[model samples]
Target: MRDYDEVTAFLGEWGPFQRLIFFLLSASIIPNGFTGLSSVFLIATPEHRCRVPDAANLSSAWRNHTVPLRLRDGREVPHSCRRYRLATIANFSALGLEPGRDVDLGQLEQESCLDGWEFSQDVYLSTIVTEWNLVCEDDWKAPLTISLFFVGVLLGSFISGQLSDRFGRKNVLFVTMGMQTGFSFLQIFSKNFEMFVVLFVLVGMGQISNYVAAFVLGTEILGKSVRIIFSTLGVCIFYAFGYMVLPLFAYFIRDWRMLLVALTMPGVLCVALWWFIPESPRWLISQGRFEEAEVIIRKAAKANGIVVPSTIFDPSELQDLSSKKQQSHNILDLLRTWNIRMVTIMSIMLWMTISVGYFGLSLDTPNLHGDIFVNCFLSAMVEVPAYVLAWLLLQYLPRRYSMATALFLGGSVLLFMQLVPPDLYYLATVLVMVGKFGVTAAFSMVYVYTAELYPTVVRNMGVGVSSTASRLGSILSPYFVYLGAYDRFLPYILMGSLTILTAILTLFLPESFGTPLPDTIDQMLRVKGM
Candidate 1:
């Protein structure tokens, strides 16, 4: 009953000031969607073959035979890395011995792509892969680059959560936003892989840190009714909208460098949000800055044109709130209590599962059937409806059941796809998007669910701790798709099995559907609804 909501409950939700904040913060989050998924197109590996230096001397048919081929399912498959020795292939053509005509294929020698590679210009004119020759033996660099970016995310999640607690959410948000937009702008001029990776790490750290601030900030400023809708329909849906359009931009921009230049240009304008974004009055009062909080609180009521008495607060409550020393909370408090610890643990597991499933499928679109560009578009397009579904469940359904249902549905669909016949390729792709749909729903629900579970004092830290699990999940997510390169069903089956496991674990969490936002340590959700 002594929570900070007692201080600012007079300002109702959906007024002009609240409405401005809702759109501005959610609009700020829109770029994260594009930034995270940008790798799909930026490092795209088009159809490529080893270059032949002496191809001019040979006939059209023999010129193509410089690279050796093996029969896979009765179709010829050319080796991407190894090619016949130039001297050997050059001599064979002179002797009138054509490929598979009179030459002994087994006796021919092959070597690495010694000269260089030639890439197909059908989709992309140049990507990171084409620019740096990141193919064959060196191809591992591209995926590892993506993984390292999330490594930065892992660090930011662990650090930025606590930083916001100390420095304040508004300052941390602007600083982190600067790191992302500015460093990304610098990335376009990267001369080597090492330089590019440095900027990517900085950008990764900023992306999640600012995003965490915005998430917690909006949850705190808005009332109970608007908070759920803001997280699901407002922030989550706009992020999906940002994701769906990356392909449209990538379609016209042929070069990776310019696409980034184009993408980063829009984020530069997000700086204007600084004037509009305000410090959370709740956070200010949490630190016993009552006078500072009162200004914004009164300004809020005035913004809504509500006239009241000279003083808003219960005067005696100020005497009580000021008596407490400013004992700032740290990360360890998340695990200090038994109930808090368990909630933290389960929330971490759920967040990790959703991240791997969500980003795993988002990045895995390249391996799907049909056109690469179109497949990525549909993969992102599916999430818009998923957020709508998540919003509905958050409104009417119990948190645990809806969340578990989403994980199970996503997991089960992917599990069966391992058995899909070869002829049902299109059906297989459809099922994959359905898997994306389920995880996307789970992702949005967990964000709102996690925010409600934690008390306001350590809310950002708690969200940070859970999101750190997701950073780890994202760090490992690329390898999930990387496995598919070796075997077809390996990735889909693995994501499905782990997803279902988390679904069962979700039932143990206490329901917070109708509960008021917990504002202090003792106000935490209970095992039996205390």
Candidate 2:
């Protein structure tokens, strides 16, 4: 029986048809990149101080001193969330008692901001923080909001695979693209924080669902040579490009609403490209739609200027392929076998660790020392090289060693960040960027590696389970960054530890470089060293 790969071989790799599928699907993923990480800019909290309303009644000198100072990180700065009890200061001002001299203003009681808060408007004109008063007592809401989006993504990941299986990949892909773009536009009209957060969750669901669909569709439709490029660099590099361009859009459109609209508008244009792309021929055959599948194959062959054999898809061959599809499978089948079980477990850990480290650092970019925009842009820019390098390593090096080395390097750089002097923040920032670069490489490598580890029947299920773990990591990553409020190094310590541990775990998995992909549980077990 000819496999799908063998049957599709006549269509030729890197043809016009393959290029269109790759281009349309890859382009569809770009907006996801921006929407996924835009929270760093949209929810960013800037320098703030307690709003002192009655201070207007006092002299300029007294007013300026009304918001008491506190020592933070060795420097005295205005209290961001607290203010001195103004009644005492009012009484002192009435009696002409001088602050810091005749009156000990330091002894005055401090209370939470009663009037409101003042925000630094230098970088962002407004964010969820400035607009909704999500600071101090409500500061937790910002990270919570970001985490909720990933929670939605978590739900989306669990459902999208089953949905694509039932409905069809092309249909799900277009639906999710519309959902993502539509919700983003809805967010623009959000009258309050609650509405905006609700929309954000839907947007996240749409974002990841579309991404997963595109990836699966590309894998099924594209030829082997082009599939590797699509998997390794195609969608990823476009995503990085979108990420790289986000800061540029944010830099020009300081208003969060305007920035979101700008990022989301591109998705609308992608809706039209639906006409140019087709359903996965593999998916069609699995559904017993042999004629539909043949039409697509012939279309691809014609576009590639090749005359396919009239007997290209033999009826018996199609029956064999479709028979395999009819076999019942479930999640438990993965754990029913020992070697596959081990692969599943290790892959889950690897996915979780990669997600935590990658997103922990990406979302934390704004908080890193230096210009927030510049830091964000640099963070996105670094991934381009990371993706390129990862593609190169996947080509030349053993998969296990390549992934392990990247994780180890990332974690080591992050762990060493603890030793950098606090004053040399740029040095620390540089180290963080380098660490991010390594993790980004591992992030790309894990996808290729995990896909290679699973057999055809359970491959989708395995990757789905692993992706669910990743979403959990992403959902928790915001809290990791939130821990920085307590200790600046806490997020790094936790993420670095996980990355190193997962890297060590990677060494135990069987190396997949240059090995033929396994199509069955029995075949996978028979592989040397398995």
Candidate 3:
């Protein structure tokens, strides 16, 4: 009946070791980003014109692959020029030619041989799958699979959120983790692209569910005052740890499938969550199960050995369930009002900007002309400080100002890349990487801000909608990478320009800082500055 106590205090309630279990379980989700980084390897090289014996017989072959002929008697003859492009440039660079390097005719010819050709860079783990060519049979398959993965993530987020809301956060968390662990192990045995895609979708869905449930449970367990800070810090710390360890895993595993198994090692530890993590007391109280909520609270207090005032047990002290019910709105209510509509639009735009710019830049990993693995790791390294920047700025800067400033900075860097000559590509890439840090920080802040801007009733829905948009952006991205026939920067330019507009539009959004979260449209519109 009584409101839950502080999460820090509750942490001790679960027992000292229990808290460690929860933190470790939460860390299990960090590898999601690591798996996402696999896109660089999975689709880096389009299966175009690579040494397939009798590639000329394939119906899909065209100007993309040309065979030059020479007349034996006198002169060199020109062969048909096929329009074949590496799904992108990853095809060329994934094979070891320096990314972003300008290749001369000799180097191109030397690298053009198809014997022993692999579809994509195997990274440090190539040896594991070096003999296996599962995803290399076609150009469009990997992209198609990648799209399905994003779609799975989108559905998973919504279904997971609903399941957590309907059941209990802890229950959903364990179930999702179990599903993720099982699917990840199965993925290692996949023999072909079709099998791999199916397993990837299952893994992706389960992974997102585990993530959303854990985050929601973690936040609900915390005190209102410390919730934002703790939640944001938890996200940063766990993800940074995930990034730091991935390269080592890649270095040792040597096979893509074996590397995946190694990557999933942390997920197995998540099963321990059943014994340690508590269900959300807030959700219990909302469901009018105050007695159940009270039992958990007391357990929490007893676990921490905290003394409670006897009067705190008075029946009159119970939270007003009716008021709580009135304050909660379902997903349908989210689209019913103008203010909610505005918030939804703004939030989605912010999410899109973050997805396109932040991820677009991250995908630029293949575009960097250095040690691809080290540079990818270095780019990820920037996120640690970026998290700190989010922590500092979200507290001090106006929401619109911070969001717009970060977007502009990120867009400007990407745009500047186009102006730099090939000789300065390295500098441009580094600048873009630095700018990425700013965008990452801003993206993190947007999640917090969007949650705060909406009322409790539609808060989940609002977050869900924005999250969906981000996934949608991801789904559309692979095609964006492939469909462009002109300059590669075309995608970068479009993404940058769109993000800049997102920043500009944000300036018009009312600031929600220090404003009490709205419970209804009326409250939302009446709040000063918001």
Q: Estimate each model's TM-score.
A: 0.95, 0.93, 0.78
lDDT of 1 at 187: 94
Candidate order, lDDT descending: 1, 2, 3
Per-residue lDDT of model 2, residues 1-530, tens digit only = 65677878877788788888888888887898888899988888888998878544765567868777878866998989888787876777788876777767768888888889889888888888898999988989998999899988887777776677666788988888889999999998889999999999999998888888888788778766666688778888999989999999999998988988898888889868778879877766655668888998888888889987977777777677676666655668878977778877888888988998898889887667778789889999999899899988988899888888999999999988789986798889889999999999998888878777776555556677788888787888878755778887877888889889888888887887776555567766432344
Best candidate, TM-score: 1
Q: Rate the local accuracy (lDDT) of all candidates.
A: 0.86, 0.82, 0.63
> After best superposition, candidate 3 residue 452: deviation in angstroms?
2.3
- The ten-residue window of minimal lDDT in model 2 covers 521-530
Winner on TM-score between 2 and 3 is 2
Candidate 1 global lDDT:
0.86
- Model 3's TM-score against the true structure: 0.78
Off by over 4 Å in 3: 1-26, 42-137, 311-314, 317-319, 322-329, 455-458, 483-485, 508-510, 515-530
